[PDB]
């Protein structure tokens with residue numbers, strides 16, 4: 220949460236990145252989110268929401284892999300999948 | 309980081325079973341190695357339960373086997389698993405060797421020689437096992453093969469007096485055979501580990517014979533689940549064979565006490581030795597026959613030193629392929645001639661089949677090989 | 687309908703192993719009764735429970 | 742022999758693979774696999790047969806010769 | 815001569831044309847052939863490894879390419895023969911220098 224606060228503040232620096240954030244917010248969200256709303260949604264998450272979201276999105280899903288270069292010693296895709304879920308290994 | 313790459317045992321397991329680069333080409337013909345290993349430990353287990361219920365006294369050996377099959381709980385399924393698991397053990401042995409020959413994997417010297425030493429150990433082990441029940445066929449086949457060892461002048465006469473324990477197969481011969489049958493599968497397991505070591509040092513093969521160093525795949529969980537599928541197939545085969553007609557292969561004559569005077573006229577060992585037995589009696593000499601048996605397995609030694617084709621495989625040389633399937637039909641011919649006693653048509657075609665065996669494997673593979681060498685502008 | 691069963695009893699691997707053990711003893715019960723009913727049906731008559739009931 | 746990584750040097754290759762869950766287990770199994778196994782059958786059995794049919798005929802012929810020795814006596 | 819027909823029928827039925835493998839593709843590899851594979855230009859090496867990788871895939875699935883992609887005896891492109899010649903002649907040179 221602290222890194223999210225400080226990085227979002229320093230992301231809101233100058234005028235050109237901030238107005239870029241303005242345009243990208245008014246396209247998708249339909250609005251620009253105030254920084255107090257950002258800080259409120261930061262404080263509205265503790266470890267419970269974090270482990271639920273990691274349970275929904277990370278845990279035992281089907282990823283997409285892009286490999287480029289000297290990638291022969293990359294494990295094959297079934298190794299990634301059978302390492303994706305824990306039976307506590 | 310991980311236990312698997314920093315622990316001295318899981319380094320070995322990681323380099324044998326997990327990070328082993330497997331070729332992505334092998335068909336079900338390559339499944340017989342893991343099936344031989346699982347049959348080996350299953351034979352160890354069933355034999356060990358047999359050893360917990362067995363009394364090697366020759367007067368009471370037959371009764372002991374009887375009490376195993378009757379009053380010890382499940383002693384009949386353990387005994388039938390041991391005998392017919394030995395049968396399927398030699399079946400998977402023959403498919404393993406036929407794989408390693410026909411798909412040209414016998415370019416390797418040392419793994420092949422270790423395999424042949426394994427063949428000697430398994431043949432002697434299975435014979436000692438077959439002698440152990442102390443039945444009629446066991447007793448007389450023991451006498452026959454002991455005398456074939458006595459066939460050598462000047463070198464082996466005291467050797468056979470030594471393995472006799474006396475005048476003939478006495479009780480001491482039975483306890484010697486119990487001990488060697490009871491130890492030699494562990495020597496088989498150690499030499500199988502050395503077999504596996506030289507293979508995992510050099511590398512596997514593939515159906516085409518092309519070196520597959522561009523398409524390696526991990527061993528787990530591809531061939532692990534593939535060999536478990538092969539294991540379930542082998543288990544259903546062996547359990548059908550021991551739960552519907554368990555006397556499909558074993559001799560009916562071997563269920564009598566060892567009458568030391570009879571020699572019933574339909575004497576033969578079990579089917580797996582019979583083609584090795586067939587080369588013997590279709591050659592009109594004692595010493596020439598026993599030397600020809602030894603030279604049969606030594607032909608299996610020699611065969612990597614006669615490869616003069618500039619391919620590795622036989623997947624692409626169809627004339628040599630035809631000759632090899634002729635050798636297959638000749639093997640099963642020798643098996644059936646070993647399955648029948650000595651009669652005049654059988655004498656004719658027995659000499660025919662044994663001469664054709666030696667003449668194909670000694671001579672015909674280099675002839676078809678040099679035909680295939682010249683025939684493709686080489 | 688399969689997705690609802692995946693949501694219930696296929697995610698945490700400890701409860702997964704425990705519930706397939708529960709299903710394994712369930713299968714023990716059903717399988718022994720199935721084998722006994724089938725084998726007695728193909729051997730109606732010549733089984734010792736019949737003759738012993740008549741003794 | 743050794744592990745991955747140090748085996749060959751291959752440029753110029755791009756490989757596509759799909760997740761096993763998205764695909765079916767048997768996409769057109771019987772409707773393709775039976776012509777495939779008949780094709781593998783047709784591509785081999787003329788190389789397979791001339792040992793085995795000759796073996797079976799020699800088996801029946803030597804069987805007839807032994808039986809014919811045991812027909813008159 | 816009819817022996818050309820023998821070789822043509824033989825290459826037609828000899829398997830490796832069906833997978834897309836030329837004459838230089840199913841070679842047994844002792845150390846001489848490994849020297850010959852090392853002594854190769856880059857793009858021909860790349861064509862060799864691409865044919866091999868496709869052949870490994872085809873022999874895995876036991877699937878054979880269509881009639882449009884087989885190689886015929888009219889178009890047997892053989893390239894590995896001179897390098898193989900030179901390595902054999904050098905090995906015979908070393909044998910002569912040891913038996914001279």
Ligand code: HEM
Pocket residue numbers: 348351352353354355356358359362373387390391393394395397398433434435436437438439440441489490491493494
């Ligand atoms: C080291 C573990 C083993 C032990 C302790 C063991 C022990 C025994 C015993 C006590 C018998 C006599 C019981 C009987 O004949 O029915 C026997 C029989 C036999 N064993 Fe083993 N055995 C072992 C492994 C093997 C292996 C690896 C083979 C080869 C595949 C083998 C092949 C046989 C054969 C062919 C018989 C004869 C079966 C018969 O004629 O009744 N045994 N073994």
Ligand code: HEM
Pocket residue numbers: 338340341342344345348401404405408413414416419420421422423424426427430496500503504507511512513514
């Ligand atoms: C004692 C019984 C034997 C056991 C338990 C055994 C076990 C194995 C195992 C586990 C493998 C590795 C998996 C695989 O097959 O690729 C293997 C490979 C091999 N074995 Fe054996 N083997 C036995 C007998 C033999 C014999 C008698 C020979 C012939 C001399 C032989 C020749 C080979 C060869 C050539 C390979 C490598 C084939 C390839 O690269 O694909 N084995 N064996």
